[PDB]
Each structure stands twice: as C-alpha cells, then as structure tokens.
C-alpha cells in the first residue's frame, strides 16, 4: 500500500497474509467464514518453477499485524485444503481475478480474527465512496513490502472515467478505486486482499486487489475485482 499508515492491531481482523513455502508473504486474502478465504486468482498461477496452484504450498496467517512477529499472540496459521479460481479467470486480461481458498482447519474467531460481510449482487458501492485498502504490499512501486499492515483510504471511481483512464483494459468485473492525483494505492503484495467498506457500522468487502499500471501514479488508480457480481458463485462453491 502506497501512501498508507500502519493499521492498528485488530483493526482489520478479516485481513489474511498468504505465504508460499520458503518465500514469506506473497498475497493477501479476506476471511469470510471459519473455513473460507477470498483472494485473487492471479496469485495461484504456477510460475518460475513454483506450483502456486498447489494448495499444499501455502500457509495462511490470520490475526497477523507485523510480518516479523508471526508467532505473536492471537496469530493463527492454517494450511489450505484447496484453491478454487474463478472458471473465467483470464491471465491475459486479468478478468475474473478472484479465487476461493478453503482452510484445512477452521479459523477460530477472536478479537484479532473475524469475517468480513459479503455484499449481495444488488449492493452498490457508489462512485465517490471512501473505502479502505489494506496489506503488506510494497509501500512504493519497485520498493519492498511493509512489515506492519498498512491501510489507505481510497475512493470508488466512476466506471466510465475508469475505462477512459485505462483504455481497453477495464472489464465490467473491474473497478478503479483511488485518486486521480495518485498518492495512495495498492501495490505488489497487496494482491488478493480486501477493499473494506464502512457503511450504519457494518463492514462489507467491496472488492479484491487485482492489478494496476504501476502504483500511486497520477491518473492510474488501482484496479480491483468487484465482489457483488460473485455473490452467487461464492455461495454455490462454499455455502457462505
């Protein structure tokens, strides 16, 4: 997350860190039930001789704040039983960039581990709405990942504006969220993590960190997979 600040402990208890064997933190994910995470499909593609598609290769850290304190009180580690990429995920276009991760053993809910609510198909996140991106991604393009969970407030950008900012790259599955002036954005290593929307008091997940043209550049807000589109798919596949 570029331009963010340290999260408070327990502030984003649905935020999950996914480590690939021998590599540490690679992507984020969100807890939606005791047994299921939402993440981005592009993170679980085989690459550079490593089987990122094999669920046995991953460890999920729940209730994590600081990557250098993985054994801290309230942190839970879980193996994955499986990865369900969206059947329409496309790694040429990044369309349908969403996956479901089944935990091998359930998460125990605590003060530092709680689920985020899924928005119904009809739930609208209007343009202009302030929402939050969080993660352990790079704090500058070409930089290095944050040890402490970062948060940044960003705004939903109108789809037409978004399409025009990134011509021929934006599908109806995607949403731009950020600022035209840049400054605050997701970045590498934030992929898969949640956009968290405060509605009321209820928190819903608005999207999933997917990609962008660099990070925090003027006129290049991050792109996110939209979540209401996938409500039924999520229910059919997980029962959540």
């Amino acid at each position, epitope marked *: 997350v570029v331009g963010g600040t340290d999260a408070d402990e327990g502030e984003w208890p649905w935020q999950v860190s996914l480590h690939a064997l021998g590599q540490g933190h690679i992507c984020g994910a969100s807890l939606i039930s005791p047994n299921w995470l939402v993440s981005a499909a592009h993170c679980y593609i085989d690459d550079r001789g490593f089987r990122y598609s094999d669920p046995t290769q991953w460890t999920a850290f729940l209730g994590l704040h600081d990557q250098s304190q993985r054994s801290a009180p309230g942190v839970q580690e879980r193996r994955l039983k499986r990865i369900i990429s969206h059947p329409f995920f496309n790694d040429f*276009t990044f369309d349908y960039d969403i996956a479901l991760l089944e935990l091998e053993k359930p998460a125990e809910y605590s003060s530092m581990v709680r689920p985020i609510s899924l928005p119904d198909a009809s739930h609208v996140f209007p343009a202009g709405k302030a929402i939050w991106v969080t993660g352990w991604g790079h704090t500058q393009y070409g930089g290095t990942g944050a040890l402490i969970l970062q948060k940044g407030e960003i705004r939903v950008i109108n789809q037409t504006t978004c399409e025009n900012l990134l*011509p021929q790259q934006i599908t109806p599955r995607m949403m731009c969220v950020g600022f035209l002036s840049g400054g605050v954005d997701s970045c590498q290593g934030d992929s898969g993590g949640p956009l968290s929307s405060v509605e009321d008091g209820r928190i819903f997940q608005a999207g999933v960190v997917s990609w962008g*043209d660099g990070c925090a550049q003027r006129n290049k807000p991050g792109v996110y997979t939209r979540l209401p589109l996938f409500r039924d798919w999520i229910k059919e596949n997980t029962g959540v």
Partner: antibody, heavy 125, light 111 residues
C-alpha cells in the same frame, strides 16, 4: 542471453498443416504472454495469435481463427503454432514474440521486446 | 479493432536531420500499450520504444517517443545513414483482446 530460436516451416500444400516451434531461453518463459506475428512478402506486420503465460488463455486474428492453434510447453520453454487448412494467403515469414507486459507485477505493456529470427512458410501446390 | 494510421508513408531526409513520424490511433490508447519498432530489410523487427516514451535496451538516445490519447510521435533526432528502415507503431488491447500494427513509415536517406 535472452532468445527465441525458431524451427519448422518451409513449403506446404494448400489445405495442409504445419507446426512451428519457438524455443525460449534467458527469461522466465512462464511469466510472459507470447505471440506469433507474421509478415507476407512486401506487406506489413500482422499479429496472428497470443497465449497467456500460463497457457490458459489464447486469442486469434480473425484471419486465422478456426485454422491455427497456439500452445506452449512451459516445462520445455517452448511455444508452438499448429497451422492447418493452410491457404495461399498464409504465405509469410512467421515470428514468435515475447510480450513485455507483466500485470502480476503492476507493469503493463503491449510491446514485443524479443523477436524470434522468423521462419518462411510458403503455401503452394 | 483499433486502427493505427501512420504518416507520412515515406520520408527522405539527410543525415543529421530530425525525423518526426506520426502514429494516429482511431480510439484512445494508453501510453503503456503503445510501442514502436524499426525493421531493416531482411531482418526481424526490433523494439525501439515501449510505453510510448521508454527507449528499449541498447537503443541509441537519438530515438525518442512521445504522445498520448490518439496521437503518438517517434522522433529520430540526428538521423544516421543506417536508420534507413520501416518504422512501425503497435498497440495491445485487452478488452477486446488484440494486437494491431500501423502500416509503417519508410525512412529513406537523402544524399
């Protein structure tokens, strides 16, 4: 050290089939989308077909759709083009190309930064 | 889908002159997705400029690219006799997916 070495091609009869190969080295083949681009004698460049890094997604120019199949073998770092139902109009030098884009690292591009040496295919009776 | 129209068709300049070559897109193209190639006769095209303005590895500084939206320019600043070539512009689209090329500007060398 970064290279695409092509093989296959030559003379083929109309309605026949031919497979082109492209051996990749010096880069992480699996991380990049790859294409074939051809050039008929005295004409410009024509993109023929693309395949994503993983091989999961393929696209074709209208001119070749239904007749050509692009594939890749990431364990062998090789790109293929199976051509079939060949026509006179498919006569061209065929190049394999590596795409510079890598959205997984938030670097977006449409550029073909590495080109194979080209293989001439002539469709004739 | 996206049509790239290159102008002029042919250009003849003396060494040491500046060549300005235009690529006009039928619809907006993100600078990131616009590139230029040089093709000398009897050779594979080679990448010159990617992302509208970024010079590729080993390409001499006299080659510069600029522009945005629908108007892109390749500038060769102090043309050398070896710059005789066809220069092509090219875009990638993800939605709808595709790649297209302009039809080239042939640069010839006056003497």
């Amino acid at each position: 050290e970064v290279q695409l070495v092509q093989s296959g091609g030559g003379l083929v009869k109309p309605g026949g089939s031919l497979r082109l190969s492209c051996a990749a080295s010096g880069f992480t083949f699996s991380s990049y989308a790859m294409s074939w681009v051809r050039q008929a004698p005295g004409k410009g460049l024509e993109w023929v077909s693309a395949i994503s890094g993983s091989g999961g997604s393929t696209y074709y120019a209208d001119s070749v759709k239904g007749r050509f199949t692009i594939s890749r073998d990431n364990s062998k770092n090789t790109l293929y083009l199976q051509m079939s139902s060949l026509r006179a109009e498919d006569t061209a030098v065929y190049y394999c190309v590596k795409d510079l884009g890598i959205a997984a690292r938030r670097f977006v591009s449409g550029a073909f930064d590495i080109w194979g040496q080209g293989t001439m295919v002539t469709v004739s009776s | 889908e996206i049509v790239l129209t290159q102008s002029p068709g042919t250009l003849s300049l003396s060494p040491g002159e500046r060549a300005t070559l235009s690529c006009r897109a039928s619809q907006s193209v993100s600078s990131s997705y616009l590139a230029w190639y040089q093709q000398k006769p009897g050779q594979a095209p080679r990448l010159l400029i990617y992302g509208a303005s970024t010079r590729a590895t080993g390409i001499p500084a006299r080659f510069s690219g600029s522009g945005s939206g629908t108007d892109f320019t390749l500038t060769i600043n102090s043309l050398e006799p070896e710059d005789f070539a066809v220069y092509y512009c090219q875009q990638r689209s993800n939605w709808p997916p595709g790649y297209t090329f302009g039809q080239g500007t042939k640069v010839e060398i006056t003497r």
